[model samples]
Target chain A: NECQIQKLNALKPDNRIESEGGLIETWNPNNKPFQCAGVALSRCTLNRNALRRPSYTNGPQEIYIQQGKGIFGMIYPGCPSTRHQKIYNFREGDLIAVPTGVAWWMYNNEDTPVVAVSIIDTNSLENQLDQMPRRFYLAGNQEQEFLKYQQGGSILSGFTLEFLEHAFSVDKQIAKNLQGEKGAIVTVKGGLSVIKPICTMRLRHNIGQTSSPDIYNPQAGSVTTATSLDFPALSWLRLSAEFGSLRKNAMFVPHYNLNANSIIYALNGRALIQVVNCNGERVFDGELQEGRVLIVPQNFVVAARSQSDNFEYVSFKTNDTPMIGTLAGANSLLNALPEEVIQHTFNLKSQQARQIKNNNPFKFLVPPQES
Target chain B: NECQIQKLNALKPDNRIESEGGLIETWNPNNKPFQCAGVALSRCTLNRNALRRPSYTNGPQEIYIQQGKGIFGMIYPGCPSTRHQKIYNFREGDLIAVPTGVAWWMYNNEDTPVVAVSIIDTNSLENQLDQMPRRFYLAGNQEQEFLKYQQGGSILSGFTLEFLEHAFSVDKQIAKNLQGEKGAIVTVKGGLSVIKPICTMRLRHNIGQTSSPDIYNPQAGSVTTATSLDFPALSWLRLSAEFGSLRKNAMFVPHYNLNANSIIYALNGRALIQVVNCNGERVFDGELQEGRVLIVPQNFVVAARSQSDNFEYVSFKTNDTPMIGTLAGANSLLNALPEEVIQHTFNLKSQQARQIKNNNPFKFLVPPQES
Candidate 1:
């Protein structure tokens, strides 16, 4: 009877916490605040000599060892001027989180074999830009000039030519004709910014054809004042073809007004996001570790630097519409700059200017602003 | 799904019979003509060496081997004097039936031990006798005579006086009391002849006082008639006393005139029984082996011969009576016999007869017989 009576309390759940603290605080899925996505429990003999490649690229990743031992490698975002930085170490009975976009490699390092269990978020790939846009390397005469400026002068000094070649090859494989035309048009909403390297080399010719004839003339009558002007949606048609990378310093370029209150979680590998004000000064520097989650408030000029050796990550923009830009100033100079800057930045050639004026009259007109 | 489906069938009893020519019969206690007084399933091992001595006295028995093998022996009734009895050999898969009161033995002949399952009828012991009895060899003269009957006389023919004395002295030691006082009774109705041996030497004694001299001597008349006529319920009193080895062949006796029928089951070893008529003539002989079962109808005149080897079997009896008679037919026939028969059988001395007339006058005269 005593034995039978003791079993009455056996059904109660154990409230004790085992291992808790980490860069990304881990809690039991049954506990509050830690919503369960999915879990994998595995027991396997991992050979110390075997090479383990990342089988997946998207989503936050976490690996815990239930038995044995192994070495882990994590790649984090590094400075744009330096090569990707990686950390490697032995882990036994330890949990490791690899943020989205960071590429890492690990292997069994102990005398005996090892087994590890991993859990990953699956939605990290939905808004991801192609990897080609994430890999940045100087090429041609620019490579020589950049290397000289950095005091690392050599053909191989920048990202290797092979790396550039690989990125080009991958780009061609994934790019498709948008709207049955030659290039893709990507629009960033007012409060959001796109951070990626340029993936094409033909943007120079395309931009020359689309620019207004007076953009290169300089002495055409001064453009008069207008109550409001609406700009076309930002397009990668020319920029993707001309520049080796898109965003300057990977900073947000405001297009429409933003509420400046909403927050967004970075689901993938670690990122160093710089939040800047309208003056282009850094406001805050937030580090997102591979299983680490963060919330970015709206209206912040967010710039993400990939800690990964290759600086790989997916960026998600959240807003009901593209009309709300990042800046809150009702009549700020920032709102008047896209047209003036575009005209001065690009010069239309004569034959390209005639084709654009004859085939499309609305291409050069300043339209009314969207409600 | 297949595994789940298979597990569903395991919830019910497996009543299917597997062997060729095997039949499955279900016996519900409520069924007529086959009343179940007691039912039990038991398993036991057969010891070959220990089985040299008898174990059971009488009862029906049934044995089934779920596994293993052994040898079984039975003494067939009505066999020719010159024929040799043979033992029955059984294998791992065998079902055997031994009738009531048949003497038999079993041995585990295989190198590996055997397990035997058995079911028995308990009514035989309950309805027929008071308690289960046993038998051991009677010491002295009777034991010497039995030994001589078993061994040839060649060695004893040349024995001198001293040798004879020594041999007889050793023979006395071998002799033992065979019958125990208490034993189970097996009874049947409807005049079914039951045959059983007098496994022990039992004496039937009459305790009747002398009757009145002026009228008639009640002791001079038939004991049964005396009860039916003059004395009505009063007649000769009879009790049985058992002697000889009680551990082996013990006492067994039957009852008559009961409303309900009875069947006895031997839970272990074997037994022999002699069925006699009212005149004490042996009518039928039966043997009950271990694990075998037997059904005896009402009104059967039966007696039992216990086995002489190892005694392991227990006799189970079922009767409607709350208390059974110590001596078979003692309570039922106490006042039922004819007075004259009681007198002749008891053979009272002259002094005893005079004392009966002076002591109990009311018992001397016979009344008119019942219509």
Candidate 2:
């Protein structure tokens, strides 16, 4: 109770910002008062033709389109000066990441709304106002507090109105109109002006397409990953997304992340999740159905299983190159414990203890009912 | 006693890189065993018109002006292709942070010399060399002691005075001169080519010119914080600075950070700092007065008490927003313990145990007279 703050549910519009387009809900240390302050996540819903204007933040956000489709605009930190706006066909469950100090936005160009969730890290955040991440909108202001002068107008004031009109002798009214375009954080009519070419990766092609996984064995379930290293565009952002498939009536034995904390969003799955601290005391445990999320802190041992068919879920890692430590199996602490101590601890015969230690390469859930 | 290194002193020129302009002394985990391998700090000095050439590194640095006035030059990450040179005045107590992968330099233009110190962090660092920061100089070099390059020249190019003049325009002498002109890491003459107008902050003043600090309680102590949110220039940087003043003989009770570790640099006065592990066992302890630095790992309980007018220190938190939980306070774990258990643990009489609970709000370490 003193340490654990359960984030066992998905974020909804209970705490939200509603506009003409749709509503936005966010979960962070400040608002939710649970979860680590170093990271935050948000759920956004954009109505048809509604557009969230170009903006940036102090940290990177890993986004997953939950429903509908839209146009995604982004400008990498060291990329070209131009706004590389593009329309990427995003079906449900497509993964995307926005790097720190980047400029990007989303527009619901479809006939209906678009839903998505973005988890952000504030460990390296810089621009914090009101003890929260300061959002800088170039075209509009979602957090529109200032009326006289829209919040932080000078962030992108490289080509000012003064220069366009005074130096170039452009139309005064046109320059004034362009400069005075009071942007909304969210708008309806102005969809992305430029739509460049894009790709459609239907969630790493493992759910139904591929037979084997990047990490697979008949004994253990399969794990397929699509990291920033795999997708060059996700390279600059220190994050990775993965999908896990657990075979029927089998368990994904206890294990913990070596260097990364995992944020799991369970989709199309029913499983029992249990986590334990270093002392073997349970840290968190809950049953997961479809459309649920959980946080597995770095270095905490976890085990999950489903009684139904295979259990599958999506997990986001803080690090791109993840290293995990399995608490069960050949290399587990159980195997390393003194042989006599192991036998005595379990009140088992020496031969039984040896059998337990020798046979268990318990790396994965184990022999599926069928191959 | 643990958790404090008093940085109450200044650096000298002996352990420095002597240059034509002045000298510099740097300390990281490799050189100064106290600081963490992921972070470092350095002291610099420059005489009149001396310039430290533009350079970039794999991490962010927080700088403080300790002596005479000077100018700051920088090139933001995604700005124009060419150097975006600008100048800012630095006084005796100014704080400035340089973001990672950003090109920057410093110049002393006054009649006398200037002194400064910079603390660097490397959580998002890249391409580290010999367990230290790898600097890429654009104009000149500082720690330039490579024998191959020291026979000096041809670092920017693999070829020697090759095709720069042959392919581009026909100014043989000028082109030859430009490539042949090996830049200096620290130069005595030719100061920065560009200098623009800027703002005058007394270092402690918030950007909006407010005097009330973000944290204050003169009875106990006071703290002034400067993060990226307050100083827009520190926008791209994650590290936030704080100046803390502990009141005479007052105690900053045992507490631990929730999500971020902290690095402390002492400024003045006498104090004893102690830290304890999560198991309530002491990890470190020391009597600190001046010029020493200290590190407090995340979630370690720490306490510090000042004996002089005020023990001042500068602290940099690894997280943008920090949370702290006090261990020996009003809501301490001790109070939560049952009365009989507390009495039995200490073998205290019933009256004494009852008195302890009855008398202690346990708030703010104010039993000045001591029981």
Candidate 3:
């Protein structure tokens, strides 16, 4: 048998990671400094309106959503203005990214909390220079800003504003502060919050190191790792863990600066997040639900809020640099609405118009940059 | 087209001998030294009985037989003398390696001479220090003085005389001032001889170089030289130029020492070869017809002789090594004869003789090692 051991030992080890909960910490055998690690798939449960805050000032992240529904948001650094961006609804199997240093938010807009999973790459921002706060918001004045942005014109302006004041309780200054370094808070009624590391080391820590060997070891004299788990050379921070249902209207806040170039997924349920940049301008305002992944770039602010009764999701990050937008001075499609739409609902003059004519209406609604 | 030229120019050049008789040569880029070469399969003629001699003084050789029928013979270098370890007949579609410095032969017993294309690694003998002729054969003729000790009777009587004659042929007292240093001739026949070098070359010379690039440029975009012929890896050599009629017997003879570890194939009619070792011993004697390949090991005296009529046969050689043997030496299944057949064949021999002397008569009938 020891001879067999010699033969078996002569064979090269399988360096791949696969399975429902398998994880790979590092691929380099020489123990060199690794840029990122890989994660395996997993499942978890969240209660109604439960909140989770991630502090990843040291890395990027990614997530994959398998089930449920909710809203997700991201806040970016150097945000140009407070004009609420259009709220994009996230369905199942969507990919989203929360840029580094950007504050973002997520909310369960559904009546019940949902469950979800995600993967992240934490080493991206680790040992980096700058750190910024990332957080989440739950049923705040920011919600009104989102609703007002979404209503667009006078068609449903009256009804929408009433609904916004009653449901979201709009407060412009609070909405601005929501994107600050202190991080926004989520109100959790009842739900579970699951958090996992992007690397296998973290996963080992979560499940305990004793179970780590099972990830690579086989039961018999056979190969356990699958060939498909070997990703391309550039891939980092593969699939992480999953989470379940959360309480109604829970706000999840991140403690450390959210590294840019991270991705998160909503495996289940629906949630929303508001994102602001360093300029104190709202960059991302949207909902991330089940079956969708969110991608966050670096140097942005973010806060997540749960609007649904039950919300669940996963988050991921990466150490890889985020793909920067090539378009200069370009606004998100959500923030590029026509002047007539902004004035009819928020009674605010367009920043573009005021720059030329200096006429204003609904000055309270006018973003600070325009004022 | 220019890009193609650039790609071709980027490839390394081949240096090997070039033959005018439709034997094309090309360089292989993947392998280094003599490894990167190619032989043209379609241009080589099968009706060339090139492998006539049986045994040599050096080690095995690599060859590729593309067409025709012929017989190959070889002896294992360090095999026990009591064991009849020899390779016999062979055929087409076979790749083989003839072991170093042993008695072997190939025969084109067919009506036509067998054509063969081949290559060799010349650096082997330069590094081998124990390759002198005196060390090959038995020391003295005990069979002549001590006849009672002779088991095979007069069958071994000629061995002593042959050794004495070989010693005289190489001694300075007999030939005084012979070119190419004093060396012992182990075996001698028309067109086939094996000699052990008294003084080895300090450095190895390139053996595959050729003279005619037009006829020997087997592969596309390869360099041709007087000592090397470029050929591709994993290819066969077929018949191109016709010698005479297939109804007549023809043979091919190499003036220089032929590389042994090569494969020979019979393309048309049946043919045979008498293989003699340096010690004047009959190492292997066999025949091959069309669709059969014979593997001749390196360093054995080989002489191609034909026995067929009506259908002319062609022969070709290849540098395909490690050919699986048809007989019982490595990678074989036939161990002992069945009891019924053994009783019939060895009816006169005692049970102890049958048990102690395990020689298979069937091994004599099979083709040489050409898996």
lDDT of each: 0.29, 0.55, 0.30
| 1 versus 3: better TM-score goes to | 3
Could you give candidate 3's per-residue lDDT for residues A221-317 as a string of tens digits? Answer: 1001101122221233322222333344544332123333334445346767665545656545778776444444344544555656555543443
TM-score (C-alpha, index-matched) for candidate 2: 0.46
- Between candidates 2 and 3, name the one with more favorable DockQ: 2
Off by over 4 Å in 3: A1-371, B1-62, B81-85, B99-111, B117-170, B173-371
- Lowest-lDDT window of 10 residues in candidate 2 chain A? A145-154
Query: How well does each candidate superpose onto the true structure, as a TM-score?
Result: 0.17, 0.46, 0.21
DockQ metric, candidate 1? 0.00
Q: Tell me model 2's lDDT, rounded to 2 decimals.
A: 0.55
Q: For model 3, what is the error of residue B251's alpha carbon versus the real structure, in angstroms, after optimal superposition?
A: 37
Question: What tens digits encode model 2's per-residue C-alpha lDDT throughout B175-287?
Answer: 56656452343565666656546122222323111245654565666667776567655545556666677677666655555445566767677777765432223445566
What is the i-RMS of every prediction? 60.8, 28.4, 43.2
Who wins the DockQ comparison? 2
On a 0 to 1 DockQ scale, where is model 2?
A: 0.02
Model 3 docking category: incorrect
TM-score of chain B of 2: 0.70
